């Protein structure tokens, strides 16, 4: 099955093999397709095919009364009518079948994908919907004009929305673990808070299990355990800052005696519907305002060590042990001993 989209004039029609492009760090799925035009209608004109990318940065002041600044990260454009002789000479099986079926009315095109592009990730819409979304937009656009710099024609333009898709890796590493130690001037004895996960690689819909261990060598009594799952979503291009988006929280009231140990497995289940219509939440891209899941974690090569414009998604869980004795730092004061632990949540391809 392949996808098709026609112009309002009906003389231009673009056939693509698929809308979801699954890439990896090294291997990428290239963009291929054909464009059918009418040679007896588009006389003395030029038809071009481009793959474009854009970001629509949003601000709280801009949300009330502003125009969304659109910035193009990358833009590659090739000539499709008249055909360039320097283009790719062999055809793919898709392109071979489409050329054999349609004849000389259709012309093929291929595009490459650089490995330093952001995934198709958008932000949670507000209570009032502008009708224009916010996030990384990709499109394939074909157009016909006498002049390349004409940007006002609409009826001879065809645009299709595509999505950059990443798959969960099938080679998990060791179980992630973390430990923190807290000491105070008022109480020299250490408090050890350790937390570990059952797996490193998670699938969408899989709840998380954490083994929490507490070693209390002082006279303080543990009051509560707050386990918070957060999306550390960072955009390098907009600013040198990273948001700490709330995703899930679990407040357990299990107490621990002073100068004792404790070990307990907790289970957290990040329901999406709890985080409905919350600004700052990043989700996977979708077409025609359909339903979508949480944004998958972005895989980045360690060797490159380079920043990435757009939205970079990563998930970390923090275990805040809220402990208090009373009087040492204040009667109503408490110590929040917290440690973070990264995790990966993606969606499997097969």
């Amino acid at each position, epitope marked *: 099955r392949v996808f098709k989209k026609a112009s309002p004039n009906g003389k231009l029609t673009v056939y693509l093999g698929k809308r979801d492009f699954v890439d990896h760090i090294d291997l990428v799925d290239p963009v291929d397709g054909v464009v059918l035009v009418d040679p007896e209608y588009l006389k003395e004109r030029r038809v071009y095919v481009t793959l474009t990318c854009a970001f629509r940065y949003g601000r709280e002041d801009l949300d009330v009364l502003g125009l969304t600044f659109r910035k193009d990260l990358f833009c590659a454009n090739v000539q499709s009518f008249p055909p360039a002789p320097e283009d790719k000479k062999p055809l793919t099986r898709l392109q071979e079948r489409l050329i054999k079926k349609l004849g000389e009315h259709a012309y093929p095109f291929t595009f490459e994908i650089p490995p330093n592009l952001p995934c198709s990730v958008t932000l949670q819409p507000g209570p009032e919907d502008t009708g224009k979304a916010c996030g990384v937009d990709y499109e394939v656009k074909a157009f016909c004009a006498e002049n390349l710099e004409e940007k006002i024609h609409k009826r001879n333009s065809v645009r299709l929305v595509i999505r950059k898709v990443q798959y969960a890796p099938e080679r998990p590493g060791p179980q992630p673990t973390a430990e923190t130690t807290r000491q105070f001037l008022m109480s020299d004895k250490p408090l050890h808070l350790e937390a570990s996960l059952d797996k490193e690689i998670y*699938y*969408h819909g*899989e709840p998380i299990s954490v083994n929490v261990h507490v070693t209390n060598n002082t006279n303080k009594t543990v009051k509560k355990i707050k386990i918070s799952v957060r999306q550390y979503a960072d955009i390098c291009l907009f600013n040198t800052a990273q948001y700490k988006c709330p995703v899930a929280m679990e407040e357990a009231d299990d107490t621990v005696a002073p100068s004792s140990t404790f070990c307990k497995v907790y289970t957290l289940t990040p329901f999406l519907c709890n985080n409905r219509e919350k600004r700052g939440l990043a989700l996977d891209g979708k077409l025609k305002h359909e339903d979508t899941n949480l944004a998958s974690s972005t895989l980045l090569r360690e060797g490159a060590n380079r920043e990435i414009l757009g939205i970079i998604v990563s998930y970390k869980v923090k275990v805040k042990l809220v402990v208090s004795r009373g009087g040492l730092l204040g009667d109503l004061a408490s110590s929040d001993v917290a440690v973070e632990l990264p995790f990966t949540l993606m969606h499997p391809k097969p």
Partner: antibody
Amino acid sequence: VQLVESGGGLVQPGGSLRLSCAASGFNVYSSSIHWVRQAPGKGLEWVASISSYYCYTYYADSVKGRFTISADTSKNTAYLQMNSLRAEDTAVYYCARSRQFWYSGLDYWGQGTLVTVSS
Amino acid sequence: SDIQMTQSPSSLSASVGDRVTITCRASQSVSSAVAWYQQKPGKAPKLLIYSASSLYSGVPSRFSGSRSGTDFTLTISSLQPEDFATYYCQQYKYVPVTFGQGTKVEIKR
């Protein structure tokens, strides 16, 4: 993984009941829960669906206004409360589980329970 | 989006090893969301065919099929004695969810 329907049998029209669907070997956060019914002499038709991760509940047109459903995610147990019973509700009810991340269709099945609505 | 799915025939006679072709024609365009299930008498149904081309895991290779327009054909290259059950076609794309009529495979005598 097991799916066990419970709560069937002989009931009266105009009454009410609770049909449960116990589950083991999975979590409802990874799946969508569907209820279908087989009338005597007829095939399977959809009744209701719950999507736990999306938190979206859908109802057939024939059961809107009379039936309701919830689910216990800590026990993975579906709880369909039926009210305003009629004679055409006599059927074999199947509780089924589908994958949410990819719509593979019906995947996990129970054996279903027979409900007979007669005075 | 009520799609009328006409399954044909309602019953057919065949012998062991014959190629059985059962059609299911939708009233509206169903591009890929085609599934086929097999139900035994007194037993829960199982999933046989999914997305009109993919064979479900655990299903023997003798079950296949193809789509032309809105009409899907389920093909059994070698009919088995344990396959003498009821077959259902199903769509899973549009709301409400619709279903077939049921084809029972009988022994040709």
